[PDB]
Amino acid sequence: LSLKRALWALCFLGSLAVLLCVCTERVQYYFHYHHVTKLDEVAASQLTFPAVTFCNLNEFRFSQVSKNDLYHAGELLALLNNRYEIPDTQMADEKQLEILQDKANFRSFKPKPFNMREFYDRAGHDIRDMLLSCHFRGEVCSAEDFKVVFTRYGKCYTFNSGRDGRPRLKTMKGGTGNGLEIMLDIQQDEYLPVWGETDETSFEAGIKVQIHSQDEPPFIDQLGFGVAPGFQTFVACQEQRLIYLPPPWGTCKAVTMDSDLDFFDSYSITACRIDCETRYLVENCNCRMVHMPGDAPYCTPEQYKECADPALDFLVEKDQEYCVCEMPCNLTRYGKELSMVKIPSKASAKYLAKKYNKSEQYIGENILVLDIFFEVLNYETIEQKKAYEIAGLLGDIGGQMGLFIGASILTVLELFDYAYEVIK
């Protein structure tokens, strides 16, 4: 037991402390399951054009609501009082109030059956009326190109939905005149009159748009942006494909051939929420709002103050953790940039107000032009990458085990052999 032996043994038992204090650090670091992001910009010569849902901020027209419609659902759509009578009409236009009062007689009126879905599909705004000239990549478009969808805003329309077997439309050039370009007439004179401000009374005009991939359904109620009449609105989109990491690295639901949804063929963070709401309503009181899928009968207007708004508020506010919507491990989303130009120029005001027989004032306050296009033909890709894999773990453990004590797993096996041979 000399000083060389003692010093060497002490240095070994000192170098063995650092080895463990570092190996356990690496093992813990691996078991945190860290990741890092990789952003890239892939240039492409073709991008599939997104689906463009949009619809008027007016749920449904005033010239289409009828005597029958005003009876069953007059109270719901905020035109009649509780006792089937018109509320205070101090701030009421004379002609508008007379054209409503004759619709609210109910003198020996024999009500007919009422279907809320049928009401929306009839009183809602018609694309054949709003759409004045659609264009796509300079080729004339049509009102038959817009598919009818039903949302909380009523009867909305989706362009390039990719549903009903139609092929999704590709775009070949960026820039302004190489995408969708629709002139709309929001029909501001069909808007429901506002006598008194209720909780939900809305004073705005214009339409609401959402730009989404064809996989997910429209969700304009939360994901839309407004565009205003009398304004060329350029919407420069940017495709953005996102790869996420499943557990344990992240929290995402790897896409399977089928969806984990009772009402939707494919899975989406939005389809999940719509499915949750529909299932909750159907299981609670056996009816669905007009905008939900499935087969249950639509709620009658009586079942909206007794079954729809209460249950939906209950689910949203305090009961919010029934359905946890895992967000898919990859999806394409569309960023956007908005800009505006005045419509119409003094040069072409009269041409429009003659092309449509309407007044120049009307054209000024009713006509808008969406112009949705890709800025440049490339897509951003945002990936989550696993930051420390098992091969890296073995490398980092071996390279320092062989730096501090110069051992290997075979050296440990030989040491176990020797320890066994002693004990025998």
């Epitope: 089928d258 984990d260 949804l261 009772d262 949750c276 299932r279 609670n284 499935g294 029934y322």
Partner: nanobody
């Protein structure tokens, strides 16, 4: 993968009570309506009962009304059919599958025969 195995069903005496259990794997049943079916020997599957994903709503057939009970156990992947007052008219193999999410492998099914 989607197992959806069904167990706990055996031949029973007429006017007897039996309990049928299914173990759905492969999907989050928490958000899946679950239905029971009768494969009549030589005939197509006929729905027996359906329960909502939340368990609040129960649907039955014509002959199943007020004779069967459907129970759904959450976080246990088990659907319970509380059969009662059985008759030979319901002697068939029983299949449990998601009602609205029909594109799934159908399990073997437990045969219950109400003879004696």
């Amino acid at each position: 993968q989607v197992q959806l195995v069904e167990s706990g069903g055996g031949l029973v005496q007429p006017r007897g009570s039996l309990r049928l259990s299914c173990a759905a794997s492969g999907f989050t049943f928490s958000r899946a309506a679950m239905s029971w079916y009768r494969q009549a020997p030589g005939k197509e599957r006929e729905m027996v009962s359906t329960i909502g994903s939340f368990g609040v709503s129960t649907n039955y057939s014509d002959s199943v009304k007020g004779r069967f009970t459907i129970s759904r156990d959450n976080a246990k992947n088990t659907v319970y059919l509380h059969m009662n007052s059985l008759k030979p008219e319901d002697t068939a193999v029983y299949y449990c599958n998601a009602r609205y999410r029909s594109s799934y492998p159908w399990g073997q099914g437990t045969q219950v025969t109400v003879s004696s």
